[PDB]
Structures are given as structure tokens and as C-alpha cells.
Amino acid sequence: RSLIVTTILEEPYVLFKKSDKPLYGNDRFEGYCIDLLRELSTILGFTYEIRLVEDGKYGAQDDVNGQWNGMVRELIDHKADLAVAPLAITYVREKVIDFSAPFMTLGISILYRKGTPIDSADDLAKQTKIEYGAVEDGATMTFFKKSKISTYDKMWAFMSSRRQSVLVKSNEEGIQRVLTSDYAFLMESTTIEFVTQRNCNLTQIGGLIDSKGYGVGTPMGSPYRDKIGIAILQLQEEGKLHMMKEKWWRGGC
Amino acid sequence: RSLIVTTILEEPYVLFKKSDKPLYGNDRFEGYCIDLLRELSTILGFTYEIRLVEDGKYGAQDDVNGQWNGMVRELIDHKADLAVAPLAITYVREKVIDFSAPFMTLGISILYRKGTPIDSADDLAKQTKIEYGAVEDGATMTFFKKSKISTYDKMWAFMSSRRQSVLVKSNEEGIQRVLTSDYAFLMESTTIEFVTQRNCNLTQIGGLIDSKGYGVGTPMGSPYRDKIGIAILQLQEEGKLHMMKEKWWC
Ligand SMILES: N[C@@H](CCC(=O)O)C(=O)O
Ligand SMILES: N[C@@H](CCC(=O)O)C(=O)O
Ligand code: NA
Ligand code: NA
């Protein structure tokens, strides 16, 4: 039986292939996560169908009913067998689904314009002129929402007080927001690493605010958690994941 | 019921506490992994007995008979509930035991003296005057043993042909070897970082050769795997793992 694989458009992990003729099914997709999915498919010997998360979200829990959305929700309701995307491994998520060994390490950080006085999250926290934000219902926003670290708690007070105006629908909207206003975008380090390559005016501010990994998501108790985990450790050890990142992290500047 | 926790002596993760008054049981130990163990115990609400792995090994598989040793063996045989140690998460171990989410990330690198022209693994591989080696029956040795990569295959040929002379029983023995002879030691970058803080004549050569994490080990299928994973992710996210590292790490 073919596995249902939920994912989400996000350069350069997952993106539509550009071509003159219409592409169909799995052929439509390409990127780091796609190559990874291919590798896993070969190593473990399964067939699959790629489906984009219906609500177009990563995954967050509503604090009124306690229900999840996005890919996480899709996994909880067994609507998909795997989630192969830049899906962050967090404690709130690991509580409701199972992750594989991480295939990539990263960390929350800041995207801003070059040559400013701003140098750390602390600098943004103790001022209100420069607005800052994050992707809504993402792991970053949740990090700030759950944080008890003074600075980050402050920053979350700001963000929540300004939800409609500072929380964006996607990394792309956040980036453009940085490019079109006095705005600092809290986002994941790897994606910043890719983004600054196509914008000479953009840069990462400070260091990593935390340390996490991307993992393949599976429903809780799934037998694919360990299989896929092993496969990922193998790929990492023989240097294939590194090669894949080399391949997909290039895009003038 | 109390859990049995296997571990291994290794500064600064686990060491015997210095004291004038004789210490007993868990009181005997301190280090990064002991603090970690304490946090897991607080969060998950278990008690425990720390026991050093009897054979003093991390865990590798015997080529001939296929038997495992060390902490990995202790977990396989259900002689321990957890392994809390600087135990590298690897593909081959993951096939026989389970690991929590990593509490620390690292990679294999090179410990050597300062001031030489040696700048990489490749530099070591293409010569023989400077001997080099690794801990026997550990993740690094196994990495070299399994690698299809030319340079690393060549280094494995070198190490294996001189196994008796260049492989060591412990990190400390490899460090002493670096300190007392023309020898380069292949070891994990976190511990290198700890060492080059106490020996100002030593340094890491080159970057990371691979990437891996240390995880808490459990037997395959253990229900504790997930609970510990969640606790580790919690600790990471609140900044505690970082504080522990700052605490325990010229
Ligand atoms: N990769 C994130 C989404 C983007 C972000 O949170 O910055 C997640 O898994 O939720
Ligand atoms: N930390 C290693 C032992 C030391 C080494 O191999 O460098 C292990 O888990 O086996
Ligand atoms: Na889980
Ligand atoms: Na396993």
C-alpha cells in the first residue's frame, strides 16, 4: 500500500518544478525534502503520494479546545502516514506525534537589514519602534508564546499585542515585510541562510536563539518512526544529507 | 520501582565527586549527565540507581560472532532501563536499541598539538610518521570501520593494521598519548572542546568530519524513550541544556 505523504510548499525544501508542460502527481514537486523522500522511499521500499497540507499550516494547538491543525493535525487523524517537510521537532508536538531522528539541525534567529545598530533579540525587546514578528501557528511563534525567558516573554507580549500586524502567513510574507518596512523577522536559521543569498540587503542578527532539528513526522506509535530514523542516520553518516544541502542551498549575491 | 541507569566515567559528563567524606551510591557521581539525569528524574517522577557499565565500554558489535558489548549490550539484555552518558546516536545502534531526542550535537574531529602543518584528516591519511587512532569499540572507530569514503577507508586501513599500537581503551588514554608522543587522536568535538580548555598546547585540527548527537539510550520498544525525548526537548527549549553545558565546560 502506498503511503500518504503530507508536506508544504517552502523553498528550498519543497517547491513546484518549473516546466513548459503541465506536471502531474509526485512529478510536480522538487527540493531537499523531495530528494529525502525519494531516498527514504528507496531504502525502505515503499511507494507514496505527495499531498500538500490542506490548511497550509505547519501545526499548532488551539488553547481553547486543544485541537491541532496543519500537518501535525493530519498526522494525528491518520490522514497521512508521513510528514516530510521542514517540520520542527518541538516538545509540544512530540507530545502528540512521533518524530524521526532529525535530518537537519537549526535554530530560531533574526532576519533584518544590514548595517543597523540592532545586534540581538535583546535590542529588539527593549524598543517598540522596530516591529518584529514570526510565522503564525509555526514553531517559532509557539517558542515565544511558551517561553519564560524574560526577553522572549517580553517579545511575545509585544507580538501578541500586535498579532494582526506582526504575525505573517508564511516565511515569504515575513521576508517581504522585512524588505518593505522597519521589520525584524524571527525565523529559522537554515531558511535565513538560503534567503540572504538572494537579497544583498538582508542578514541574520545575533546568533541562534535556540537549538532544534527538522524531523519526519509520523502518527504516535507508528513503526515508520524508527525505520525512517535509521534510514536518516544512515544517509547522514554516508554524507548524502550534506550533499543534498549543498545542492539545494544555492540561489545572485 | 527505581530504574537502573547505566553510564560510564567520562569527564565532564560523569566523574567521581571529589570529597573528604566517603560517598555512597548516586552521591558518588557528578557531571553534565548526572545533572541531566536529575532533571529527567524530576520531570518524569522516577527514582534510580546509577551503575557504571561493568565492561567499561560504550558499545560495538563483534565482527565474528555478532555479539554486542558495553552499555548497548546492557540495554539489549534489559540489564538497564536507561543509558545516560555521552552515547552517540548511530544508524547501527539505532537498529538494536532506542534513543531519545539528542541532548547535545557534535561531530568527529581531530585532537592534536598546536603549531604543526597538519590541517585536516586528509593530511593525516597521506602520511605515516604521525600515528593516529581512536577509542576501541566506540562510535568513532565504528565510523571509520564502516566508511566508504576514500580518505576514511585509508585511515581505517592504517588504524586497523596497527590496532594494538594506536587504538585506546578510553579518551583519557588517547589524550595522554597526544601529550606524550607524535600522535593524533580522532574523537568527538564536544570532548575536544573540554580538553583544549585544560591543555593549552593542544587544539582541534580541521572541522567536523560528521554530525551526530548524544541521546539517552533505552531498550528497543521501551515506553520511556518517548517520555525522555519530551523531557529533553523541554530542557533544550527552556535553555537548561545550554546552562548545564556552560556549567561543565586557557
Ligand atoms: N518550520 C516551522 C515553521 C516556520 C517557523 O516556525 O519559523 C515549523 O515547523 O513550524
Ligand atoms: N561517545 C562515543 C565514544 C567515544 C568515541 O567513539 O569517540 C560512543 O558513544 O561510543
Ligand atoms: Na510522540
Ligand atoms: Na531502535
Residue numbers in the entry:
A (entry chain B): 431 to 544, 555, 566, 667 to 801, 803 to 804
B (entry chain A): 431 to 544, 555, 566, 667 to 799, 804
Task: Copy out sentences from the published article reporting this entry, exactly as the authors wrote them.
Desensitization of these ‘non-NMDA’ receptors involves rearrangement of a dimer formed by neighbouring ligand-binding domains (LBDs).
The second mutant incorporates a further mutation, T779G, which in isolation selectively slows desensitization of responses to KA. Anomalous difference-Fourier electron density maps showed no peaks consistent with chloride binding for either K531A:Glu or K531A-T779G:Glu (data not shown). In both cases, significant anomalous difference peaks were visible for sulphur atoms in the vicinity of the dimer interface, but not in the solvent-filled void between residues 531 and 775. Similarly, in the K531A-T779G:Glu and :KA complexes, the interface was rotated by 7.1° and 6.6° relative to the GluK2 WT equivalents. This movement was larger in the double mutant, suggesting that truncation of T779 to glycine allows closer approach of the protomers at the top of the interface. For K531A-T779G, in contrast, there was little difference (less than 2°) between the interface orientation of the Glu and KA complexes.
